[PDB]
Ligand binder design. Structure first.
Ligand SMILES: Cc1cc2nc3c(=O)[nH]c(=O)nc-3n(C[C@H](O)[C@H](O)[C@H](O)COP(=O)(O)OP(=O)(O)OC[C@H]3O[C@@H](n4cnc5c(N)ncnc54)[C@H](O)[C@@H]3O)c2cc1C
Ligand SMILES: CC1(C)c2[nH]c3cc(Cl)ccc3c2C[C@@]23CN4CCC[C@]4(C[C@@H]12)C(=O)N3
Ligand SMILES: CC1(C)c2[nH]c3cc(Cl)ccc3c2C[C@@]23CN4CCC[C@]4(C[C@@H]12)C(=O)N3
Ligand SMILES: [Cl-]
Ligand SMILES: [Zn+2]
Length: 664
């Protein structure tokens, strides 16, 4: 396909604002409709996942309008995504060759555990992702992901309106099929708001809980909560001076210690690009995905920036997520002038490994506009007690949130977004087909499992977060108990069988494995012991011995009961096939390489000879996926064949769950 510059030229011809050029791509028009079936407040990632999944699950059934306050897709923290997210993108028609032009490659998770009392000592836990012919994970700049899903939504019959705000003071939400009146303005100052008459309102306003807060007070869990502070840094081409052995920038890297952990995420940034030019680039990429353009014939990221007049750079997202019972010095003025900067730099100099690590990175000033060099957010975890009611439901962060760790926010949270999307079709039809009293009663009963799932979801994720945090207080418990159990309980068994029809049903059974009984049994034993040791103290060595022995005893039985075949010793660098810890083991599959020209991390497969980010050609390591232990040519062909195309929906087939097999 020849690239078109439709939006760039339309914007210049009409001198259109950012919101006006975006809204001009709507199928129904740039102005709000008088009526809709569903109105979604908020076009964050979940509001858009919801609208995309609802239209894809059953096309041409629901008229859906998404209302977003930002004039263009705004900055969000939350950049790391997991295989279930990519699978969802692939099911919606965008595979890795196209996504990697916009987003950074993610190949597994790596954890480094720093000893607080023995500075310089550390251990690690490293895993790999998948071959390029299997799947990819992504590090996403959120202004780009929300733009991608906006354009994709607009191309699938969904209207998205930026620069428009739901007025929750005058909005009326009623049950049955009686009808909502959603008031939409451009802000407080706008005294000519519009009304959308509609059947279902979806609260996707994130942590702001703009609608469901009216129905219940925000709920907090017992015990300590977490604070976060972060910033953006350069992304070094040469990672060889990082003070951790075998470090690789294309993981989501975690620097873990008693007080909390640091995330390190390498990703490309498009900041500075005009919004109209970005729409043209994204539209071109989708036209290429529609036509099936092969990766080596698709322009590279930097070539796209030249074609469409964009700005492109590599950055590292680095942030702390620490417990809010940490004692800080009263005066931190020596480390900066703002609290976020002060606490970031104070914590770095508390660990020599963190300071040696950070000395590979240069701070970026105001990457996302003035005042964005430093970010801080306090008291992260919460839950919404009420997530549905007459005429409305909530999804995503509006239901609750725990912690960045293991990225449940996007990847687990999309279970609610996609289930609500599926449920939205019968919800709307019930109201159009039955009198008001019975309609409301039938909708209420239909949503009882959705309410019950949300109610138990956040507490389970909260226990999962505390489980990892307490084990991060020791360099043996971290990798050998917490990491091991999250990977065994949470690896996505039978993901290659998921399709659009089963996606929500599968996703709600995942929960990162946090509902697995043996997982909860080990987590409760560790939490119960470690929470009795004050944070400023080292864990007694006998406590670590006992928790380790208890964990390994429960592990051996649960691993023997799992009937899912997996080359565990190839995926986890430090463990054998039976998930036994091996002290000196370093062997692992090799799925990626770093481009010598631009530093971008690449997936190895024989049909991607050039760097997808800068276009530089490689010389035969792409065919050099290293399987260790090796696979025959037939086993390798069989692996790739399983992941080629998702199977058609077979209503006779029973859904296979991602969690380990029950012991029976
Ligand atoms: C420090 C930190 C790190 C994190 N890291 C990760 C990670 O690595 N991976 C991960 O998966 N998750 C991560 N998360 C969680 C993740 O950021 C959230 O789960 C995710 O952004 C939730 O998306 P959402 O669409 O529900 O809400 P948001 O993305 O917050 O979107 C809400 C939208 O609603 C709009 N809005 C608000 N009020 C109105 C109104 N009245 N009218 C119209 N629109 C309105 C806002 O403009 C906004 O765009 C992290 C969270 C934190 C705090
Ligand atoms: C199941 C997947 C998505 C997975 N999910 C993880 C979660 C954590 Cl926490 C760590 C590692 C993984 C992996 C690595 C896997 C293991 N599978 C072997 C056959 C195909 C596949 C898919 C992929 C593969 O090639 N790599
Ligand atoms: C398990 C059930 C109760 C179920 N549980 C869900 C949870 C969510 Cl979140 C979404 C959908 C479902 C469904 C619909 C199912 C899926 N199964 C396919 C084989 C038999 C069965 C049973 C039934 C079926 O025919 N329909
Ligand atoms: Cl992650
Ligand atoms: Zn390159």
């Amino acid at each position: 396909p020849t690239p078109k510059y439709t939006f760039t030229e339309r914007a210049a011809a009409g001198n259109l604002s950012d919101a006006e050029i975006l809204n001009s791509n709507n199928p129904t028009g740039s102005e709000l409709p008088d009526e809709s079936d569903v109105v979604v407040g908020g076009a964050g990632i979940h509001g858009l996942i919801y609208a995309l999944h609802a239209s894809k699950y059953k096309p041409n059934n629901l008229k859906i309008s998404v209302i977003e306050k930002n004039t263009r897709p705004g900055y969000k923290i939350g950049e790391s995504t997991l295989p279930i997210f990519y699978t969802w993108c692939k099911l919606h028609g965008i595979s890795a060759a196209y996504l990697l032009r916009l987003f950074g490659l993610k190949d597994g998770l790596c954890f480094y555990f720093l000893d607080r009392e023995n500075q310089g000592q550390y251990t690690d836990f490293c895993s790999v992702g998948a071959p390029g012919l299997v799947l990819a994970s992504l590090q996403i700049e959120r202004p780009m992901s929300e733009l991608l899903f906006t354009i994709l939504a607009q191309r699938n019959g969904v209207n998205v309106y930026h620069g428009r705000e739901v007025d929750f003071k005058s909005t009326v939400v009623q049950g049955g099929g009686q009808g909502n009146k959603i008031a939409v303005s451009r802000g407080k100052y706008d005294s000519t708001p519009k009304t959308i008459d509609s059947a279902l309102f979806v609260d996707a306003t994130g942590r702001f809980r703009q609608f469901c807060s009216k129905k219940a007070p925000r709920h907090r869990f017992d015990g300590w909560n977490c604070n976060a502070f972060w910033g953006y840094f350069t992304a070094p081409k040469d990672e060889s001076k990082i003070p951790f052995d075998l470090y690789e920038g294309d993981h989501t890297n975690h620097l873990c210690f008693p007080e909390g952990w640091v995330w390190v995420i390498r990703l490309p940034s498009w900041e500075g690009s005009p919004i109209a030019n970005l729409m043209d680039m994204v539209t071109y990429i989708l036209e290429c995905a529609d036509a099936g353009v092969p990766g080596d014939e698709l322009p590279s990221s930097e070539e796209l920036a030249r074609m469409f007049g964009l700005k492109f750079q590599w950055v590292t997202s680095i942030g702390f997520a620490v417990r809010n019972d940490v004692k800080y010095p009263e005066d931190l003025s020596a480390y900066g002038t703002r609290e976020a900067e002060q606490k970031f730099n104070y914590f770095v100099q508390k660990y020599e490994l963190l300071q040696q690590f950070m000395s590979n990175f240069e701070l970026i000033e105001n990457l996302y506009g003035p005042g964005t060099t430093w970010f801080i957010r306090k008291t992260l975890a919460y839950q919404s007690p009420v997530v549905s009611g007459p005429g409305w439901l909530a999804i995503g962060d509006a239901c609750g949130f725990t912690n960045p760790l293991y990225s449940p926010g996007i990847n687990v949270g999309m279970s609610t977004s996609t289930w609500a999307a599926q449920l939205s079709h019968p919800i709307v039809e019930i109201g159009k087909s039955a009198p008001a009293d019975a309609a409301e009663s039938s909708i209420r009963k239909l949503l009882v499992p959705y309410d019950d799932y949300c109610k138990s979801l956040v507490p389970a994720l909260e226990q999962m977060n505390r489980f990892n945090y307490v084990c991060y207080r020791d360099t043996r418990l971290g990798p050998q108990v917490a990491c091991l159990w999250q990977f065994f309980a949470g690896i996505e068994r039978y993901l290659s069988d998921v399709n659009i029809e089963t996606f929500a049903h599968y996703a709600i059974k995942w929960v990162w494995g946090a509902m697995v009984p043996e997982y909860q049994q080990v987590a409760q034993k560790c939490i119960e012991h470690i929470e009795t040791v004050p944070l400023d103290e080292r864990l007694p060595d006998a406590m670590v011995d006992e928790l380790l022995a208890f964990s390994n005893r429960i592990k051996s039985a649960a691993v023997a009961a799992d009937d899912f075949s997996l080359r565990w010793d190839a995926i986890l660098r430090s463990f054998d096939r039976s998930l036994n810890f091996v002290e000196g083991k370093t062997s692992r599959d090799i799925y990626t390489r770093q481009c010598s020209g631009c530093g971008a991390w690449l997936q190895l497969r024989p049909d991607w000879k050039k760097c997808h980010s800068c276009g530089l050609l490689g010389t035969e390591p792409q065919t050099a996926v290293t399987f260790d232990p090796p696979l025959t040519a037939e086993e390798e062909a069989l692996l790739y064949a399983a992941w080629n195309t998702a199977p058609k929906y077979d209503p006779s087939k029973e859904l296979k769950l991602p969690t380990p097999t029950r012991p029976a």
